[PDB]
Design a protein around this ligand. Structure first.
Ligand code: HEM
Ligand code: HEM
Ligand SMILES: C[C@H](O)[C@H](O)[C@H]1CNc2nc(N)[nH]c(=O)c2N1
Ligand SMILES: C[C@H](O)[C@H](O)[C@H]1CNc2nc(N)[nH]c(=O)c2N1
Ligand SMILES: CCONC(=N)NCCC[C@H](N)C(=O)O
Ligand SMILES: CCONC(=N)NCCC[C@H](N)C(=O)O
Ligand SMILES: [Zn+2]
Lengths: 407, 411
């Protein structure tokens, strides 16, 4: 009922009680752990609204005040009548900040209380959505000095009028299959890149073509829009000692902006809620550049480095990986675009966990995601026991819209 | 019920039915996952079902399920239990059992090898001197002049929990650690407490950075006794780097034989509290964890200095740079001395082939992702991209508390 987690490097032991407030299910049972699986009504709504509004008023030191109870009646009356309800601005901001605070897979949560919330609930069309998104992109990018933000479009109603951003991130590169059988660009986006084409996009057919936004408003068919190029900050990748590195022709964008998730607050569902922060270097250098199913560049780099690629035991992949990652951090830093290294980020998250334990009685965390994809054990999170559980408000995955939309 | 696992790199999807034969608990519930938590006297009553389940698996495996030989063996064990409160395994069932505990070890990446295990039956042992002799023979056999061979030695099972055989060392071969008055540690900080116990028991400590510890052996519930492994039996490798000539002068070496001695082996409800086993090293165990953990030898800085890396900011990735070089050095050294070792790429690729084979022929392979993924270069190994299902099968290896915490001193 009261659980302890230990850091095996420092012996620090924390007691978790926050998990008892957990509500949603994990996918595990007493017989089987699924910790490494990637994807494990009016009557229903008031209980969810009540639970939310109680935590909200408790947070503002007004638990069981008249203003607390009045709002509970108000929302009750509103549900019983309209079969849904609308969040006050204060509640919406609180709900969004807490969805982030509760995101067990996010290592950057020390930042959670500094989130700029853009309320786009007045939006009615895809052009309106495009305008909101451009403003989000420019605000957050801030000439390289990145600031966290989320833009929140109207909540789901009958599910036949959903707002959706079809892109997985606001800014990503296209992927094309060639006769060669190979992939040009980002293989992760081949399908979407095709859906854009099938929709009219004129692909440049290059290695780093910024996809267009495919925006869906009020359940209508989605429309294409090109983000003003001048709003998309990109970084050419060079190495501080290998002059040949620049010749690899690599670049990445400065703004990570996840756009395909669903925000749930007080039982209300916001299916279009793009949010952004800034990168941890490994995301680009380890995963985007080196995953076999991504730009998969280890072989080329290794060759430029003249390493013995004869045998795995020379660790040539590991050598190349380090250099690639030095280059990413160096390039973002030189151009003054915000980026965090994995050492710095994980040390932050350990401090965040400790704040959260003493202030909230816990911090849900998914060790499988939090531990960086390179140099795991030389980062402090590797040695930290974590407990994973689901709190609400939350960000949730949702099915790709094209598998679900009826044209 | 069927459960699927996908590899996100290859899109290969596998179907698990084996988890259905899982009995023990995981520590997780529908409301909480404890997948990253390090550690999350039976009655006649609960013993015969444990025996039956085991013997039924054993007899199936030899294609004799339901045979007369099968039925007579159940009856014989049953009678032995009612009559003596326990039972003895046949040598064949012991071997099968110990191979299976390894097969079922979800935190072990080396399992492609499970069916090649030399089982040394030490159930006739009665004294700590007898244990010493069995352990020397195991170490010599397994070492094999550098061409390492997996082995396990199994001492008598638990009876009333008052006559336990225990190896107090956590591994048969390990280096001493000494806490200094100024708070620094000399040697391996992981073994300070055990080292202190050895010294109190009369060990004369050389007090250097790589002193091989003495064995502390408990037979039949008696107080443990100290023994020195013959030095000629302890194979060691001096660590040097293929391009960095100053690496040798760091003064590093390690031992070739990893041999876990503190686990409990359960087979058919029986409990073997002393069952040391050994295989060979994956390089990262030494070069990442034993050398670079802050709480172990902690050599990252000194290596980084020697290499003259920019150490003023973490974002130069100097730690990551020194880590790769150290791990190159460990693999280079073991290879050069012709001592078996496996790199993390080769090891994890083999594990994926093992795991897929196991799904096809066995219906599953319990695996603990947190432990299987190596502690450097995680995502450039194929295991990182592999969904895994973790669940508990018997026979099995289990943790048990350190014996200095539970032992009744006779004096
Ligand atoms: C400001 C700096 C931030 C940093 C450094 C950061 C870091 C990360 C990283 C490294 C991941 C793993 C992503 C992956 O491997 O694909 C992640 C996941 C996640 N982040 Fe954060 N993040 C930041 C901001 C935010 C913000 C502003 C939000 C929401 C408002 C957020 C919500 C999430 C969620 C929900 C996940 C899991 C998403 C999934 O399952 O794909 N993050 N974060
Ligand atoms: C043949 C070469 C082998 C290799 C390369 C190998 C590899 C590994 C590694 C890297 C670990 C994790 C170690 C750690 O981080 O502390 C491990 C754990 C384990 N291995 Fe293997 N192993 C091998 C042989 C064996 C054998 C022969 C057995 C038993 C007969 C065995 C049973 C186990 C068990 C029970 C664990 C979990 C240990 C724990 O929880 O501390 N392994 N193995
Ligand atoms: C199968 C496994 O769950 C999967 O590869 C996970 C592992 N950890 C991860 N961690 C992060 N941060 N991002 C990821 O995409 C993944 N992928
Ligand atoms: C807290 C966490 O579970 C702990 O550090 C684990 C993580 N993964 C591991 N993996 C292996 N192979 N060995 C270990 O000691 C650990 N330690
Ligand atoms: C979207 C908020 O920012 N979080 C973050 N740093 N990364 C989120 C996912 C980005 C993805 N891993 C990528 O490498 O493009
Ligand atoms: C004992 C069977 O072999 N297993 C193995 N390779 N490692 C076991 C533990 C060794 C430990 N990680 C060490 O670094 O000494
Ligand atoms: Zn679990």
């Amino acid at each position: 009922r009261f659980l302890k987690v230990k850091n095996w490097e420092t012996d620090v032991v924390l007691t978790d009680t926050l998990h008892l407030k957990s509500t949603l299910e994990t996918g595990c049972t007493e017989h089987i752990c699924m910790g490494s699986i990637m994807l494990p009504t009016k009557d229903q709504l008031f209980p969810l609204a009540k639970e939310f509004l109680d935590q909200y008023y408790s947070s503002i030191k007004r638990f069981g005040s008249k203003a607390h109870m009045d709002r509970l009646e108000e929302v009750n009356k509103e549900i019983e009548s309209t079969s849904t309800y609308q969040l006050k601005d204060t509640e919406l901001i609180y709900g969004a900040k807490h969805a982030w605070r509760n995101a067990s897979r996010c290592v950057g949560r020390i930042q959670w209380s500094k989130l700029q919330v853009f309320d786009a609930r007045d939006c009615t069309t895809a052009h309106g959505m495009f305008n909101y998104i451009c403003n989000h992109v420019k605000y957050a990018t801030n000439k390289g000095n990145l600031r966290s933000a989320i833009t929140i479009f109207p909540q789901r109603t009958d599910g036949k009028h959903d707002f959706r951003v079809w892109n997985s991130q606001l800014i990503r590169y296209a992927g094309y299959k060639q006769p060669d059988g190979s992939t040009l660009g980002d293989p992760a986006n081949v399908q979407f890149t095709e859906i854009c084409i099938q929709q009219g996009w004129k692909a440049p057919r290059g290695r780093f073509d910024v996809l267009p936004l495919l925006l869906q408003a009020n359940g209508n068919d989605p429309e294409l829009f090109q983000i003003p190029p001048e709003l998309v900050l990109e970084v050419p990748i060079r190495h501080p000692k290998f002059d040949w590195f620049k010749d690899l022709g690599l670049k990445w964008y400065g703004l990570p902006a996840v756009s395909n998730m669903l925000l749930e607050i007080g039982g209300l569902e916001f299916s279009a809620c793009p949010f952004s922060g800034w990168y941890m270097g490994t995301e680009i250098g380890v995963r985007d550049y080196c995953d076999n199913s991504r730009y998969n560049i280890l072989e080329e780099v290794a060759k430029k480095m003249d390493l013995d690629m004869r045998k795995t035991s020379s660790l040539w992949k590991d050598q190349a990986l380090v250099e690639i990652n030095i280059a990413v951090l160096y390039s973002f830093q030189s151009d003054k675009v915000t980026i965090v290294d994995h050492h710095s980020a994980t040390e932050s998250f350990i401090k965040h966990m400790e704040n959260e334990y003493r202030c909230r009685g816990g911090c849900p965390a998914d060790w499988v995601w939090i531990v960086p994809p390179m140099s795991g054990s030389i980062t402090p999170v590797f040695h930290q026991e974590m407990l994973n559980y689901r709190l609400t408000p939350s960000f949730e995955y949702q099915p790709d819209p094209w598998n679900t939309h009826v044209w």
